[PDB]
Amino acid sequence: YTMSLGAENSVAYSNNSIAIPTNFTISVTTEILPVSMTKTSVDCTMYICGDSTECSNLLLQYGSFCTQLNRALTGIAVEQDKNTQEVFAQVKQIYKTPPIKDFGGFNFSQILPDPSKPSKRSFIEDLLFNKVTLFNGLTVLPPLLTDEMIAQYTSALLAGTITSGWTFGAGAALQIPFPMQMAYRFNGIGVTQNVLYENQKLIANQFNSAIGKIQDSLSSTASALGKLQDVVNQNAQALNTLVKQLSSNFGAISSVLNDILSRLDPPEAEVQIDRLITGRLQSLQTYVTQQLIRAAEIRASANLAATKMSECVLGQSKRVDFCGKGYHLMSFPQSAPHGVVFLHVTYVPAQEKNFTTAPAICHDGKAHFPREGVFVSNGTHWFVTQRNFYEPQIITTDNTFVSGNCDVVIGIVNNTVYDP
Amino acid sequence: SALGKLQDVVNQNAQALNTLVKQLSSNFGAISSVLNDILSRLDPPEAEVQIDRLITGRLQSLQTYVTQQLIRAAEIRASANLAATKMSECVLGQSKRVDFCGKGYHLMSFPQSAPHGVVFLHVTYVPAQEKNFTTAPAICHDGKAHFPREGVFVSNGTHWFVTQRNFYEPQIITTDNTFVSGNCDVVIGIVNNTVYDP
Amino acid sequence: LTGTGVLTESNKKFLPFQQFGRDIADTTDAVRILDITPCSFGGVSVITPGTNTSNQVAVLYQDVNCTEVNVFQTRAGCLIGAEHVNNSYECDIPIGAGICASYSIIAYTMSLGAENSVAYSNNSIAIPTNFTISVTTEILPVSMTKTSVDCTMYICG
Amino acid sequence: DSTECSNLLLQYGSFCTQLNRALTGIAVEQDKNTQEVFAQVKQIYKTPP
Ligand SMILES: *[C@@H]1O[C@H](CO)[C@@H](O)[C@H](O)[C@H]1NC(C)=O
Ligand SMILES: *[C@@H]1O[C@H](CO)[C@@H](O)[C@H](O)[C@H]1NC(C)=O
Ligand SMILES: *[C@@H]1O[C@H](CO)[C@@H](O)[C@H](O)[C@H]1NC(C)=O
Ligand SMILES: *[C@@H]1O[C@H](CO)[C@@H](O)[C@H](O)[C@H]1NC(C)=O
Ligand SMILES: *[C@@H]1O[C@H](CO)[C@@H](O)[C@H](O)[C@H]1NC(C)=O
Ligand SMILES: *[C@@H]1O[C@H](CO)[C@@H](O)[C@H](O)[C@H]1NC(C)=O
Ligand SMILES: *[C@@H]1O[C@H](CO)[C@@H](O)[C@H](O)[C@H]1NC(C)=O
Ligand SMILES: *[C@@H]1O[C@H](CO)[C@@H](O)[C@H](O)[C@H]1NC(C)=O
Ligand SMILES: *[C@@H]1O[C@H](CO)[C@@H](O)[C@H](O)[C@H]1NC(C)=O
Ligand SMILES: *[C@@H]1O[C@H](CO)[C@@H](O)[C@H](O)[C@H]1NC(C)=O
Ligand SMILES: *[C@@H]1O[C@H](CO)[C@@H](O)[C@H](O)[C@H]1NC(C)=O
Ligand SMILES: *[C@@H]1O[C@H](CO)[C@@H](O)[C@H](O)[C@H]1NC(C)=O
Ligand SMILES: *[C@@H]1O[C@H](CO)[C@@H](O)[C@H](O)[C@H]1NC(C)=O
Ligand SMILES: *[C@@H]1O[C@H](CO)[C@@H](O)[C@H](O)[C@H]1NC(C)=O
């Protein structure tokens, strides 16, 4: 068929009509970002020749490409370590969650470290690790930061986020009861603190339900970590392709160097060695170039991940869709085998209602504009509310300001303004 | 080693050029690394065979160097895009992004030149001398719940004040800097207090 | 068929018509039944606190269980010449697998940072009473040397 | 379409698969770039008459 771009709808746009939500949704979405890849070291002399002195002699008379390839691979490994350090080792102190989990009904046991010691990983981290499944001079250099240390970094970041908000990302951590932290975050997205202080129980229940939906999605729905799996698969495919190319004839009489040496005279043996060296060296050049390109891509992804950690996790971001769809509230990091997972907690408007607006109010031959919010009328009664939530208030001189007469404003209506 | 990044960049470039020069004087499987001796010693068929071999080797070395230079140029372009962005919203303005231009609340930045790069001196605000106070989500007065317009309600042990979030400026609770948004029967943590009406 | 490696008793079962056995990469693995496993090999790294600070060095064999050949064993391989201390310091020379070295040469596990527990409780906040103006230096390369190579002159001369 | 090329390339290796995989990955990446840049919404809104 021809793919459909999405649902087709027409929005009722009028010069005196607005739609304001009367309810909200706390939605938790998951974002996957690769942070690093496997550190592979290739010994060029061992790969091309395989501990044969004569092939090594012909290689060293050929040139110094081996040093260049080793330097490139070493630089790739150090870049991977730096990527891991920059994404994870950001906070200079390891914060510990207090034993009394009094977060005003906001459950966090699914992302907090489990006291039962499952390698000091949260239950979500355990599912993330379990969901992804991971001789010729080819070695795998272990990462500098172990999985437990990465988990401890994530736990410290998460504990600092809960117990201090964004204060610990800008200096010394300052304790906050985590309810006024949510009130501050609501203030950041344009919602007054009264919404939280009226619907705290509902907000906590919705947040726990969203975490549970993430629980079910990670438990049942597979292929949720497609990016990390794709990175691992590409690296494994490239390595396997190099391994397969090790046993190519390249125009020689045999792909086994030892067989050539034990069968053929030194002049013809060395010309066959030259052919094999040319082929294997070209294959290694191709592999190193692809590895460098992939390392650059992974470095860009890790820079993006570090920016997301610093902006979404250590604070509240006003950037649209940078930390999840909707008005971003907070983010929680979770460790992944070769990357990171961001649980973005966001505010989504819902349950909308029609209203009639007016730019200003003409009262006593004067134009009154709202300080913050918008003028809305249901039926024949006029009120002022806030943009992101329907909280009507009586129009009063305190929350409105006067600017000129009501002759130049287009769309102004006649209404009374209460003077207290 | 304060300017270690620029030093690393110039060292990498110098190493690449030095490696190219060294590879120029490599045998590449021929009889000698010099071409004039090949001309003066061999007959035209063998001479052109050795010249072809040397051309192939040097062409491979030059392509390797060019590819490395292209990768490094892409990385430097990314770094320069980052630098231009940092200049754009940290020198030409104030950035609200966390840790983009310094550890702490960024105030302003100053750019300075460098032999092959730029250096940003980020002036940032860092809180210090933290003190512990007793808080409440709202204040109950005349059967009504009062919330601060901006800031937070704190208590020093006996009296309740309202201050700002990033600094301690305690002020008496007043109807001017507080707003009423309901009663005291729904707010968790409500604390009874009086609000001065001027 | 000539080669270098270690002959080992094989638990795999061959067939009467089968003589050689090759695993992935089409390389010889088992020969008639004896398994061929090449002897241990790997890289050699040197850990030094710099020539001026000291003349002492430690040798790290990566991916080699060097019990066959001050000895420490880590997931990154084995280390010779360093005394294992059970303290926790900031990493100075990154060895790998969470293990670093510092100056006698000691090897330890990385200290992730100062550990403190925020005094988190309801109706309690921490508010600063003073400010600090901090200037932080950040360095970003903007450009590199523009080099032009004439291929005709370089290759031929 | 010469059999000698196939004969001399089957022993040369599997570079053709590498190049095809690289080009396929590039093509998939461009499709993803367009998809990410242009499909920021899932509803096709229409301007009122
Ligand atoms: C908002 O939705 C929740 C259920 O999601 C409901 O319990 C609540 O009453 C709604 N709010 C209003 C004002 O109707
Ligand atoms: C949080 O959820 C876990 C299991 O989902 C439960 O054991 C725990 O009691 C919950 N905490 C609160 C405060 O409800
Ligand atoms: C309210 O708005 C919706 C969509 O914005 C529209 O379909 C509906 O007709 C409006 N209702 C009234 C009474 O205008
Ligand atoms: C409009 O809504 C307000 C709610 O504040 C209510 O007091 C008023 O009666 C409503 N007017 C009409 C005409 O429904
Ligand atoms: C909206 O447009 C209509 C034309 O259909 C006009 O009669 C009306 O005065 C306009 N109202 C405002 C507030 O602009
Ligand atoms: C508002 O009232 C004034 C005075 O009664 C009148 O001149 C004007 O036409 C009214 N405006 C509207 C929009 O009804
Ligand atoms: C009191 O303040 C200190 C520093 O000012 C802070 O680190 C601590 O969390 C606070 N709470 C205590 C000691 O209960
Ligand atoms: C709190 O401060 C007020 C005035 O700033 C003072 O009257 C009172 O004695 C103080 N109480 C304590 C316990 O420090
Ligand atoms: C704080 O929590 C304790 C129990 O942990 C409770 O007794 C107290 O009433 C709470 N105070 C406020 C202001 O929420
Ligand atoms: C606040 O005062 C009202 C009446 O004056 C009383 O009913 C209520 O229990 C008081 N609350 C507290 C926390 O003292
Ligand atoms: C170490 O540094 C010193 C002074 O900085 C210098 O003289 C020496 O050459 C360096 N290395 C050696 C060989 O000690
Ligand atoms: C080395 O081998 C011994 C026994 O052969 C084993 O106990 C030890 O775990 C190995 N060391 C490592 C981690 O390579
Ligand atoms: C740490 O290591 C030392 C020496 O390796 C050993 O005595 C013991 O396992 C640990 N010592 C202490 C005091 O924990
Ligand atoms: C704040 O620190 C400065 C020095 O940085 C000092 O002069 C001043 O007395 C301090 N202020 C307070 C209120 O302690």
Distance CA C111, CA A145 (A): 11
Mutational pocket test of ligand 11: of C52, C55, C103, the residue with most ligand atoms within 8 Å of the beta carbon: C52
Give the separation between CA A332 and CA A312, rounded to whole angstroms: 8
> Is the C-beta atom of A354 inside 6 A of ligand 6?
no
End-to-end CA separation in angstroms for chain A: 65
Chain breaks in chain A (C to N over 2.5 A) after: 134
Q: What are the φ/ψ torsions at residue B82 (nearest 5 degrees)?
A: -60, -45
Beta-bridge partners for C106: C83, C102
Q: DSSP string spanning C6-33?
A: EEEE--S---TT--EEE-TTS-EEEE--
Give the Cα separation of B141 and B139 in Å (integer): 6
Phi/psi at B79 (nearest 5 deg)?
Answer: -65, -40
Give the CA diameter of chain D: 67
Give B-chain residues touching C126 at CB under 8 angstroms. Answer: 130-133
Q: CB pairs under 8 A, 24+ apart, for A213-219? A: A213/A28, A214/A28, A214/A30, A214/A110, A214/A124, A214/A343, A215/A110, A215/A124, A217/A30, A218/A30, A218/A124, A218/A127, A218/A128, A218/A131, A219/A127
What does this entry list as its resolution, in Å? 2.4
Work out the end-to-end distance of chain B between its first and last CA atoms, rounded to an integer number of angstroms: 61
- A410, A414, A415, A417 alpha-carbon torsion, rounded to 10°: 70
User: Any idea which residue has 């294992």 for tokens?
Assistant: C84
D42–A11 C-beta distance less than 8 A: no
With tokens 């269980």, the residue in question is C65
* Size of the A and C interface in Cβ pairs below 8 Å: 124
Apex C96 CA angle, C93 and C101, nearest 5: 30
| Type and span of the H or E element at A342 | strand A339-357
Element (H, E) at B24: helix B4-24
Closest to A198 in 3D by CA, of B187, B159, C39? B187
Q: How was this structure determined?
A: cryo-EM
User: Within an 8 Å CB–CB cutoff, is residue A160 touching chain C?
Assistant: yes
Do A and D make contact via 3 or more CB pairs under 8 A? The reply is yes
Distance CA A37, CA A231 (A): 7
> Which of A8, A245, A290 is facing D14, going by the closest CB pair?
A245
Contacts of A384 (CB under 8 A, 6+ apart): A370, A373, A374, A375, A376, A392, A393, A394, A395, A399, A400
CA distance readout (Å), A10 to A387, B101, D44: 22, 43, 8
Q: Please give the Cα distance from A330 to C51 (Å, whole number).
A: 49
Tell me the shortest Cα–Cα distance from A344 to chain B, in angstroms.
17
DSSP-derived pairing of the beta strands A339-357 and A17-34 = antiparallel
On chain D, the residues whose CB falls within 8 A of the CB of A234 are 25
Please name the residue ranges forming H helices in A262-416: 266-308
User: E strand or H helix at C102, and its extent?
Assistant: strand C99-102
Chain C partners within 8 Å of A151 (Cβ): none
